[PDB]
Symmetry: C3
Subunit: 117 residues, 3 copies
């Protein structure tokens, strides 16, 4: 029922521990963890950090970020929708090679327009 701490060490070098001095739960030295649940998995904590040197895959019909999503680079594979003001700066925004901020068109008198005003 009441325990001073928790330290469980396994013969493969893994540990499961709870240290009340630092208030830290640690599971370390394992090869795999798997959790299978019928309902939900929830974390309520200010910071979640996932440090994955290969990949994080979210295999789900929908990932929802309730506020801002920031990424280094973006790859969209199969299209999508955007609403609200989308502000691009600092490079080109090109579609089929046509650059929004610099493109020109043949004009209606046989010349060429300037780039966008």
């Amino acid at each position: 029922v009441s325990a001073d701490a928790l330290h469980i060490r396994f013969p493969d070098g893994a540990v499961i521990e709870y240290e009340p001095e630092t208030s830290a739960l640690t599971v370390s030295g394992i090869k795999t963890a798997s959790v299978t649940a019928s309902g939900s998995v929830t974390a309520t904590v200010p910071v979640v950090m996932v440090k994955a040197s290969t990949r994080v895959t979210l295999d789900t019909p929908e990932v929802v970020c309730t506020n801002r999503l920031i990424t280094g680079t973006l790859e969209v594979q199969k299209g999508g929708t955007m609403r609200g003001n989308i502000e691009h700066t600092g490079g080109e925004l090109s579609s089929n090679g046509k650059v929004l901020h610099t493109h020109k068109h043949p004009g209606d008198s046989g010349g060429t327009t300037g780039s966008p005003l």
Copy 2:
């Protein structure tokens, strides 16, 4: 019958089979460190994080839909398929897709896009 371990800092680790609920509460940090993989297989994953969720990895892959309130892309990207913007402006370096115009070829200006 059920797991209930209480610590002097107020932390609790519990499994209650009468609700089938695993609960860890009252702790400051949790961490799981593994050499292979961590997998969760469950219909709903819910993270309530008042500061931030950081995915520090070479690639995050969302297999289907990704929905966000706002988006910030820092170092460019690629998009394939039809991308349909509505409801405000899509601008690049100040030039707005749906309303921009150009100097015309006779010294006036074009209209906006058709």
Copy 3:
């Protein structure tokens, strides 16, 4: 303490187990898991796989992906910012019906421009 393994089975059929032979932590047969913590929850492992048939919700002011983010489809609800080169192909990029790579304009003499060069 040292333990040779961990195999805890409960009467609902749930199992919490650590098997040192394969260094595998497995939790199964539960309905919900919840962690509440005042500081952080961190996972450090090369590969994370989340198989969530309903949805993954990240309810936070900010989700940060440090490098690449890849998705099948994208839905931005309330705007955004982009920097760097954004290269679109394999369809149209349209805003309020106006398509970057094919749009024309009325010309300055009353005709119509060509599409973008």
